[PDB]
Structures are given as structure tokens and as C-alpha cells.
Amino acid sequence: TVGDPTTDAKLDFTARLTIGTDYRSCSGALVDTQWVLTAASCFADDPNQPDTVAAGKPAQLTRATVGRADSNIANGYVREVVELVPHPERDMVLARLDKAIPDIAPVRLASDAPTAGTPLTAVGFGRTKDEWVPIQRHQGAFTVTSVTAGAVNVTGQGGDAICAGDTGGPLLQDKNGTLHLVGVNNRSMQGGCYGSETTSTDAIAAMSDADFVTQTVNRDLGTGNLSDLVASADFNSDGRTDVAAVLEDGSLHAFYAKLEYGREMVQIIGGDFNSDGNGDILNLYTGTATGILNKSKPMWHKTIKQVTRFKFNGRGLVAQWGDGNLYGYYTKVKMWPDATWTRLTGTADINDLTAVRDDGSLNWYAARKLWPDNTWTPMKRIIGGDIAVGGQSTLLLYGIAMRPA
């Protein structure tokens, strides 16, 4: 990367990492306060064959410095690398730091690939035209020549080739002040570099992968100690009912059915109550096209024990009252001739309202026995036609482990 030095707080999300005392060195950038994205080849015995870079601890002690645009000052943060999570297909790895850096923001990821002719920029800590190792990081400029199967081919504009030590460095595209990461530098012709010479300025970078990062950074949002506040609805317009649940942070997170994790009170109930095409969550939170709930509003103008979803005439709720009666609401109807209500659950298209008896027996109402055994005694908040939080607070579906471990 040959161009002007830059220390401005636009590219302060970049990082420099070294492996061992002097074994290897390359560049990277933050995707989270705990995670740094770089190339997998940096951790390979043979950088041209980044296939053996297995997940787990680094083979050699690895350190990273973040935000230190100028190496002659202490400005910036230093962290140790504890774990590596390689990409299953291409030359890309996520590094987990021992401690977070809450002061330096990450760079947003691109939603798509840049097309040929698009003006991209790049920043790194690699070699220059006249220096083996720079004091300050530098910014160059590149254009896209073509797009291929999970990678982007670029070339330098007016010289300025990707050189050495640039591996793992980000490829950036911006619009209206917003920066997105479009790819990561892997290989280059290294023209115009100190100590070497070639005409070509061409380089190849791995294409950015937003889903890979999301399922790594948020890999452990759940599976641990969760609340019983769980509800089902389609929040991604997939035709597959998803699951939302509240974590210890007091926030509601959506897990998408294929459970894969998304990006973003006594009882919680979901469903598309207004038939808007976007699943909702006494106040109603309306769904939107972005999967984000809007501000809630009262559904009406405290002696109810349980409330669950129920479809009426194609659209609804059922409430179990402390008097043992069950009523449906659109205008209300009696769901059962007498006060015979038992744990209330949501519905599912078994052929239907599911219920759990105090003796552990499971049944459904058109009641009929739903499960051969009587082991549902400790089960809470059963949601729906597939169908509990479990004794470990880990959601099981009927009991397959829908949640990862």
C-alpha cells in the first residue's frame, strides 16, 4: 500500500498483529469490540495452503495492536489473541481477543459485492515503496476489475499496489460518510515495493462474509442461562416459524428457523396478530420488514393466569383465568363448557391446543393423549405442526436440540 500516511479517526478500527517473536506479521481490522478479522494464511505453516489452520488456540503467542496509527507513540490498545475461528471455505479467520476494546468502533460489513469499475480504498501496515516497515499506516486506492466465486479482483490506480504485510488488511467502500468492509486482502503482485520490482499492481481479496461473522460473534448469545420469556412467530418472511427469547440483558433476540441466530414482562406471546406479514409480540409490538419491532400500544383499555396464541377464523389469543375457565378473544368465546383449566400452551397444526396436566401427561384439544410418557411436569412455556424451555432452560422441539452447543 503506497500512498499518503493517515492517522485520522475514520480508519482507527484497523489493527496490526504479530505471531511469535518475529515468526510472522500481517494486518487486520475490527468487526467487534472482542473480535478482529484477518486472513487465515497468517496462521498457516504454509501461507499458500491455509487449509490446516484449525479452530482453537493459536500455535504461537499472538498479539494485536488496535488504533495505533503511529508506532512511535503509545496511543491505542494492546490485546492478546486467545482463539481462532477459520472460515470453512476461504482464506479468512476471526480472532478472539482476551479483553474487549470498548473505545474503538468496528467497521460495518457490506451487504453485497462491488462491481467492476467501483473505486475502492485500502489501508494497512505493510511495506511501502521505500520502507521495509513504516512508522505510520498508509491509505491507497484501488479499482475493481472483476468479481468471482466468493472473491474480488482489484488493481491499483496510478500505481499503489498491494504489497507485503497487507494480508488481512480490509478493502473498504464508503457512501455518505458510512464505511463498509467489502473484502480482505490475500495475495498481490507487489509492484512498486521496497526491495522488489514488477510492473503489475494486481491483487486478489476474499469477499466479505456478513453471515460468517454474525454466527461467530453472536455464537454464544443463548445456550446458557435464559429467561422463560420465549415466543414463536415468522420474523424473517421465510414461511418458517422462528423463535424469539429474552436474555439476561433484558433484550429480545430473534433466532431464525432453518436455530441460527439473528442480529436483533411476565409472559411473552408472538404471532401475526394483524396479518401484516411480519410477526408481532397487554401491549402489542408490531413487526416490520427489517425484523425489528416498533413501539407497542395497548390492546385494550390481571386475574388471568396464562395467555397464549390461538388462531380464530384464520387470524388471536386464549386466556386462562384464575377461576379455571378458558376464553378465546378476537368479542370473546368460551373455549370449554366448564372450569376445567392445567398448564396452558400455544397451538400447533398437529392434524390444536396443547396442554400439560399436573401428573406430567401431555394432551391436545380439537382432549387426546399427545405423548406416550408423562415427563412434561417440569416443562414451562411450551410454544408451537411442530412444538418446551427444558429443565436446563434450553429449548427443545418435539426433543431435538434446536439450540446450538
Partner 1 sequence: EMPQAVEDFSYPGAAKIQAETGAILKRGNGHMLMTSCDGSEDIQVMSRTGQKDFCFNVMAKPAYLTLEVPQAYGIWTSADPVKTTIKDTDGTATVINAPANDFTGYGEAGSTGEPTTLIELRVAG
Residues within the interface to partner 1 (CB under 8 A): 22, 24-26, 39, 41-42, 47-48, 71-72, 126-127, 131-133, 135, 162-167, 185-190, 193-196, 202-204
Closest to partner 1 by CB, 42 vs 281, is 42
Question: Phi, psi at residue 37, to the nearest 5°?
Answer: -100, 130
- Rounded CA separation 183/171 (Å): 5
81 and 63 Cβ atoms separated by less than 8 Å:
yes
We find the least distance from the C-beta atom of residue 32 to partner 1, in angstroms, to be 24
Cβ-based nearer residue to partner 1, 106 or 168: 168
State which residue, 71 or 118, has the beta carbon closest to partner 1.
71
Tell me how far, at minimum, the Cβ of 2 lies from partner 1, in Å: 13
For the record, the C-alpha cell of 326 comes out as 378458558
- Residue 209's SS3 state is coil
Provide the minimum distance between the beta carbon of 27 and partner 1 in the complex, in angstroms, as a whole number: 9
Nearer to partner 1, 53 or 226 (CB): 53
Name the minimum Å distance from CB 163 to partner 1: 6
CB 124 within 8 A of CB 2: no
**Residue 42, phi then psi, degrees to nearest 5:** -65, -25
**Rounded Cα gap, residues 383 and 397, in angstroms:** 9
Spatial distance between the Cα atoms of 196 and 180, rounded to a whole number of angstroms: 32
- Of the chain, the end-to-end C-alpha distance in Å amounts to 42
Q: Where are the alpha helices (DSSP H) in 100-259?
A: 210-217
Nearest-approach distance from CB 220 to partner 1, in angstroms: 31
Minimum CB separation of residue 11 from partner 1 in Å reads 18
Contact 367, 335 (CB under 8 A): no
Instruction: Work out whether the CA dihedral 42, 45, 49, 55 comes out positive or negative.
Output: negative
Closest CB to partner 1 among residues 165, 270: 165
Q: Which of 50/67 has CB closer to partner 1?
A: 50
Task: Provide the minimum distance between the beta carbon of 189 and partner 1 in the complex, in angstroms, as a whole number.
Answer: 6
Q: How far is the CB of 370 from partner 1 (least distance, A)?
A: 59
Closer Cβ to partner 1, 165 or 291, answer by number? 165
Least spacing, CB of residue 38 vs partner 1, in Å: 11
- Nearest by Cα to 169 from 63, 6, 13, 50: 13
Concatenate the DSSP letters of all residues of 223-279 into one string.
SSS--S-EEEE-SSSSSS-EEEEE-TTS-EEEEE---EE---------B-TT--SS-
The three three-digit cell numbers of residue 269, written as one number: 406471546
Q: How far is the CB of 188 from partner 1 (least distance, A)?
A: 5
Q: For 214-219, which contacts have Cβ atoms below 8 Å and span 24 or more sequence positions? A: 214/261, 214/263, 215/260, 215/261, 216/35, 216/85, 216/94, 217/31, 217/32, 217/34, 217/35, 217/94, 218/261, 218/263, 219/261, 219/404
The cell for 276 is 401484516
* Nearer Cβ to partner 1 (43/273): 43
Q: Compare residues 1 and 354 and give the one whose CB is closer to partner 1.
A: 1
Query: Toward partner 1, which CB reaches closer, 204 or 388?
Result: 204
